[PDB]
């Protein structure tokens, strides 16, 4: 099913709830690979148990993610009504976060290119004006729009994927307007006075920005705002930005949990 898991994953206009089935699928790989490990029969029967525990703890990590996978809508909606404008819900951004960090931490954690390498550069900052209110005074426009697929092009699925779990370890996890945020969770869910901008260092950066925009993408509520006479001429490039923030997010963790699993299942297979 090469193929079959391309046209999944690279299809077009994926959903909000797309993201619930990455989840539950995955749970259900992890689940069967746990049965067929415990369903072979010293030192071996160690290496299983280890192997076995790890199983255990992405499942219950996934499922956290899963859980909180509640959303329905386009994972790039693009809103230019000030009344569709919403803040996103906090409970989705924060367990999917929260699901991620434990997924993270089962198979590892710090790894990889999780950084090492300049991560510095306001020039996408203006993603922010995604994060506020649509209609009238509203300031996401087609520029803005660009900045923020600017900003995912900028950086790969593991520095996304990073950038969410530090964020799910912060402690001021609520929503706040572009301005204001310090974190990609708290950027994610927003304010309902809207703003322009990110303004605080700790955004501004691209892993921190592409996170933002993943996290909002994939969660319920969680939608982008531009003026009036602006969505035609931007909902493409934030539509596109929102997707592949959550690909490259989804497809790392996928080699996260895959590469987790295969020097657990070769350690086993050593002893």
Known sequence: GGLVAEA??????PKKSDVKTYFTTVA???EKTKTDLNSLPTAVEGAIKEVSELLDKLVKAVKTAEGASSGTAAIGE????????????KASVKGIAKGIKEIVEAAGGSEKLKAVAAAKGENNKGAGKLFGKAGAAA????????KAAGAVSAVSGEQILSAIVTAADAAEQDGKKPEEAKN????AIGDKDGGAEFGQDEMKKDDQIAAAIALRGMAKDGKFAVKDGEKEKAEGAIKGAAESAVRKVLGAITGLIGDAVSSGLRKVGDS
């Open 184 to 187: 990609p969770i708290a950027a």
């Open 139 to 146: 300031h996401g426009d087609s520029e803005a729009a660009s």
């Open 8 to 13: 999944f994953g690279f299809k077009s206009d």
């Open 78 to 89: 693009v809103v230019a009504d000030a009344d569709a404008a919403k803040v996103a819900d």
């Open 28 to 30: 259900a790989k992890l």
